Amino acid sequence: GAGLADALTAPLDHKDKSLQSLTLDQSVRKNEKLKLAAQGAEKTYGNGDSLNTGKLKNDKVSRFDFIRQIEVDGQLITLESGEFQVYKQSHSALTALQTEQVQDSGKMVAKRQFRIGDIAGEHTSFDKLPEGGRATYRGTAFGSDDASGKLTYTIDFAAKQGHGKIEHLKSPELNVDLAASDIKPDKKRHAVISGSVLYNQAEKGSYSLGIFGGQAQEVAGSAEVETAYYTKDTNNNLTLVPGIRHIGLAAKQLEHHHHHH
């Protein structure tokens, strides 16, 4: 697939597959500039700009190089550097950022972080949900340095309650269970599910999924798993501090098309 450079250069096309535009909001805030570069050329994005996801492959992670910067007195200052990840589905898509370089004034230090960017798509109205039956969504859960997570979720529309499970991630602590939670309409009446995660029947963080698709075809959100990492003091004093591991979640129902299997 060589159309990943077309996502940064070619305009929006109505014939492109599935979700063709992603509004970059949380990925780049305020006056910041998010420069994406991959394959051939590059494109700079501002807050609210559109990402031409239509020319990216569905159900796969596209990887760009991102430089998050800001202008100070007419000159761009590199705030963050790393890899920008985009997972595209048919009615929803989400982005993630792997921090590789931060500031620490004029230089850049090497720090590795990972956060979830935007989670956008055709939000399903809570007032337009099915009434009865259980939908099975299967897809990907991807975290820092691991895109092979297998996400499985199921929603009961008669009880308005869904639950899930994450498997096959490299770190066995991240293979956590998505506890049962109710379907609730958010501020914009969109159908969202928020709950906790369970490892060995113990709370280890939270998770938030959004229902996307005109007929609730897909679910897309993120999970925050509670972990603990080491901090090396200025005198080599280790401290076991708590941290959060962010996991991108994106699943879809099994499709049945008119003219192909």
Author numbering: 78 to 181, 185 to 308, 308A, 308B, 308C, 308D, 308E, 308F, ...
Recite the paper's sentences:
The recombinant subunit vaccines Bexsero and Trumenba contain an important meningococcal antigen, factor H binding protein (fHbp), which is a lipoprotein composed of two β-barrels that tightly bind domains 6 and 7 of human complement factor H (CFH). fHbp is antigenically variable; databases of genome sequences contain more than 900 different fHbp peptides, which fall into three variant groups or two subfamilies: V1 (subfamily B), V2 and V3 (both subfamily A). Here we use structure-based design to generate chimeric antigens (ChAs) against serogroup B N. meningitidis. ChAs exploit fHbp as a molecular scaffold to present the surface-exposed PorA VR2 loop, which is achieved by inserting the VR2 loop into a β-turn region in fHbp. ChAs retain epitopes from both fHbp and PorA, and can elicit functional immune responses against both antigens.
